[PDB]
Each structure stands twice: as C-alpha cells, then as structure tokens.
Automatic annotation (TrEMBL):
The chain holds residues 68 to 318 of 318 of the full protein. It comes from Aspergillus fumigatus (strain ATCC MYA-4609 / CBS 101355 / FGSC A1100 / Af293). Coiled coil: none annotated. It catalyses: Hydrolysis of terminal, non-reducing alpha-D-galactose residues in alpha-D-galactosides, including galactose oligosaccharides, galactomannans and galactolipids. Keywords: Membrane, Transmembrane, Transmembrane helix. This is alpha-galactosidase. Disulfide bonds join C58-C116, C182-C188, C227-C251. Glycans are attached at N155, N234. The lineage of its organism: Eukaryota, Fungi, Dikarya, Ascomycota, Pezizomycotina. One of its GO terms (molecular function) is alpha-galactosidase activity.
C-alpha cells in the first residue's frame, strides 16, 4: 500500500477544542483533543495537556505564507503567489517547490520535538482559490501525501483540512478531517466518508459571521443549523468565533 501508518487513530466522535489566535491560556474546556498553534505554544503547554490525559494536535499553515512566523525569511520570492482573500498578510505557496517542502519538513521536526501528537496542516486547497500559481488538485494530492508520510515518520498523526475534492486520493494517509462550515454550505455528506472509515471529522461552524467575535452564545436556530444534519452524531462539532480564540459552544 502506498500510504504509511499512524499509531494514534482518534475515535469517531471525540470531543475537541481548537484555539489558534493566541498562546493557549485556558484548558477548562473538557475536551479530549486540543488543536493549537505550533509556533506560539511551548513544550510545557503541550506536555501539560497530555499530563491531563489529552491529545494535542499542532496547527500550522502548509499552503500559505504567514508574514509573522520566525521562519518566514526562508521562503523565496518565487515560492509566493497571490494574497489569500480573507487572511491579512498571507500568500499562497508553491507547494511543489522543494524549498517550500523543506521548510515544512522543518516545521514537522519542530512539532515532533515539541511533543505534538498530530499536526493540522492548513491551506492545502490552493487549487480551489485564486492562487496565482496554477496550482492543481494533483499538486495538493502530492503535497498532502508528502506531509503525511513525513508526519508518520516522525510518529505523528495528520488529517486533511477541507479540500473535499481530493479525499479519495489522500484518505488512506489521513487520521481525520478538519472541516469548516460544511453544515452552513450543506456539504457535510462530502466529509461523512471519514467516519464511514472509522475516522473523526473535527468540524467547525462560524454562525456569527466573518467579522464578529465575542463570548456570547449563538441563537437556537444558528445552533440547530450548525449541529443538525445527516450523520452529525459522527461529527465532532465546535461552534467558534471566526478568529478561533478560546470561546467555544458545543452541540
Ligand atoms: C488569554 O490570552 C488572551 C490574549 O492575550 C487574552 O485576551 C486579551 O486580553 C486583554 C486583557 O483583557 C485584552 O486587552 C484589552 O483590549 C481591549 C480592546 O482592545 C481592542 O483592540 C485591540 C488592539 O490590538 C484588539 O486586539 C482587540 O481585538 C480583540 O477583540 C475583538 C472583539 O472586540 C476580536 O474581534 C479580536 O479578534 C480580538 O479578540 C480589541 O478589539 C482594551 O479596551 C483594554 O484596555 C482597556 O481596558 C482595560 C480593562 O478595562 C476594564 O475597565 C473596567 C473598569 O473601567 C473593568 O471593570 C473591566 O473589566 C474592563 O475590562 C484597562 O486595563 C485599560 O487601561 C483600558 O481601559 C480603558 O478603556 C476602557 C474601555 O474603553 C475604559 O473602561 C477604561 O476606563 C479606560 O479608559 C485591554 O487592553 C486583549 O484585547 C485580549 N486579546 C485578544 C482577545 O485577542 C485573554 O484574556 C486570555 N484568556 C484568559 C486568561 O482566560
Ligand atoms: C496511491 O496510489 C493511487 C494510484 O492508484 C493514488 O490515486 C488514488 O487511488 C484511490 C484508490 O484507488 C482512488 O480512490 C477512489 O476509489 C473509489 C472506489 O470506491 C472511486 O469510486 C473514487 O472515485 C472518485 O470519482 C467518483 C466519480 O465521480 C464522478 O461521478 C459522479 C457520479 O455522478 C459525479 O457525481 C462526480 O461529480 C464525478 O463526475 C465528474 O467526473 C466524471 C469523470 O470524468 C464525468 O463523467 C462527469 O461529467 C463529471 O465531470 C466520485 O463519486 C468519488 O467521490 C465519492 O467519494 C468521496 C470519498 O472517497 C466522497 O467524499 C464523495 O461525496 C463521493 O461519495 C471519487 O471522487 C476514487 O477513484 C483515487 O481516485 C485516486 N486518486 C487519483 C488518481 O487522483 C493515491 O492518491 C495514492 N495515495 C494514497 C494515499 O492512496
Ligand atoms: C512551482 O514549483 C515547481 C517545482 O520547482 C516548478 O516546476 C518546475 O518548473 C521548471 C520550469 O518550468 C521545470 O524545469 C521543472 O521540471 C518543474 N518541476 C516540477 C517538479 O514540476 C513550478 O514552475 C513552480 N510554479 C510556479 C508558478 O513558479
Ligand atoms: C508514538 O506515538 C504513540 C502514541 O500513539 C506512542 O504510544 C509511542 O510510544 C510513540 N513512539 C515513539 C517512538 O515515540
Ligand atoms: C456513523 O457512522 C456509522 C458507521 O461507522 C454509521 O453506521 C452510522 O449510521 C453513522 N451515524 C449516523 C447518525 O448517521
Ligand atoms: N493562519 C492564521 C492562524 O495562524 C490564526 O491566526 C487564524 C485565526 O486564529 O487565522 C489564520 O488561520
């Protein structure tokens, strides 16, 4: 088989929390899995989660350039394409570039060294966007399988972020899906194939819109929309602000 194996396969339906805006400073949410930023959290934060019985997924952006990272000057001018429409100071990456791929290997080394149980590589759906680099589905498939073989070789699990079109070509290498907004877009059937193969969907809904972040609950009908869809009992849903700060509501 042209995939590699992972030792940690989280169960379908495992409750999770994700917080990417700042260093994690709240573990009061009783979730089994925490998805947090790879760079801004130290080994101590990660080990503390695991000592409390939790698994830690480390987020990083595999397909976009973030101009505030400490390794940003490793990227060459030719690695960078167009701006991401909805994220400031981010640009699409040429994920076929050997330089880009080596930078990502360096980020997986760091995730391994910090004790991450898994990695959550973002922005592998450049083909679905104005990337300015002629990126294609095959490029993403090649890149996602490259990341998965590299994470597995470092004893970490991995999952697919959105990128619904390429599921059949990477799923054997994936331990889960991270999906945004499939309920709002009536697309959760696309991602149900993961729990049909014993793999969770870590599923995010943003009912408050892309410009509103606060600590208030959503309305009952916004919660029904985020939570009620065929097979939702197999999705691990969080309701979040668009900025992915601490605030979270569960179904
Ligand atoms: C985990 O870590 C995170 C990250 O560090 C913690 O979150 C951070 O917490 C800080 C302290 O609470 C906040 O600092 C306050 O910021 C207020 C608004 O700042 C705006 O602009 C910044 C610019 O960068 C921006 O980042 C902010 O955006 C965030 O919020 C929006 C939503 O609004 C999101 O969309 C966005 O994505 C970000 O999440 C934000 O828009 C600022 O007003 C504060 O300075 C004020 O307030 C201080 C305390 O005010 C208190 O006043 C009354 C008494 O009068 C008190 O009883 C009450 O508790 C009030 O809180 C005060 O010390 C300052 O001197 C200043 O006071 C003046 O202004 C107020 C109001 O106008 C007047 O009442 C007052 O008399 C003075 O005139 C703070 O600087 C960070 O924003 C926040 N960062 C985030 C969320 O990203 C988080 O808490 C941690 N969680 C834990 C520990 O559990
Ligand atoms: C390892 O090596 C292999 C090389 O062998 C690498 O390639 C991948 O290998 C996979 C394993 O064999 C392979 O996986 C899948 O195998 C399934 C068998 O169960 C297939 O059924 C999958 O088919 C895909 O396409 C289906 C058909 O889609 C057309 O038809 C439907 C029917 O109406 C349309 O809806 C659909 O829109 C589409 O129509 C378009 O295209 C037509 C063809 O050109 C055309 O006639 C139309 O006019 C229209 O333009 C589709 O139904 C499948 O999607 C289902 O499944 C996913 C989850 O898998 C769900 O999310 C969906 O909701 C839906 O239920 C599926 O997309 C598929 O072949 C995989 O394809 C190979 N990938 C390649 C070659 O790129 C592999 O990558 C290597 N690595 C690893 C780790 O494996
Ligand atoms: C993205 O990176 C890839 C890999 O470096 C580039 O593809 C190479 O392009 C040169 C010149 O066209 C060819 O000689 C190589 O054979 C290509 N390699 C591969 C693996 O395809 C690609 O040009 C880059 N994309 C952009 C838009 O610059
Ligand atoms: C790899 O991770 C698993 C967690 O599922 C752990 O049990 C195992 O000891 C790890 N192996 C190494 C060499 O760290
Ligand atoms: C969850 O997935 C299982 C397959 O593992 C399926 O049999 C079941 O119907 C799904 N649950 C719901 C509520 O659809
Ligand atoms: N890549 C960034 C990520 O680092 C985080 O800031 C997030 C909001 O928390 O926005 C984007 O996804």
């Amino acid at each position: 088989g042209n995939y590699t194996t992972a030792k940690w396969q989280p169960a379908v339906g495992t409750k999770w929390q994700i917080e990417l805006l700042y260093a994690l400073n709240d573990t009061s949410v009783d979730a089994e899995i925490y998805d947090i930023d790879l760079f801004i959290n130290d080994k101590s934060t990660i080990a503390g989660l695991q000592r409390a019985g939790r698994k830690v997924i480390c987020y990083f952006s595999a397909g976009s350039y973030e101009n505030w990272r400490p390794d940003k000057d490793k990227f060459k001018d030719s690695d960078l394409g167009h701006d991401l429409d909805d994220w400031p100071g981010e640009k699409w990456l040429n994920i076929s570039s050997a330089n880009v791929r080596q930078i990502m290997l360096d980020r997986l080394d760091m995730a391994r060294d910090k004790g991450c149980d898994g990695v959550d590589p973002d922005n592998v759906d450049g083909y679905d966007n104005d990337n300015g680099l002629d990126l294609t589905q095959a490029d993403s498939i090649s890149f996602v399988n490259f990341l998965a073989n590299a994470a597995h070789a470092r004893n970490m699990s991995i999952g697919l972020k959105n990128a619904g079109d390429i599921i059949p070509s990477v799923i054997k290498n994936m331990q889960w899906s991270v999906n945004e907004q499939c309920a709002q877009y009536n697309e959760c059937d696309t991602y149900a194939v993961f729990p049909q193969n014993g793999k969770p969907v870590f599923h995010i809904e943003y009912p408050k819109g892309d410009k509103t972040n606060n600590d208030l609950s959503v309305t009952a009908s916004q919660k029904n929309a985020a939570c009620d869809f065929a097979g939702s009992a197999n999705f691990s849903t969080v309701i979040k602000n668009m900025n992915l700060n601490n605030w979270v509501e569960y179904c």
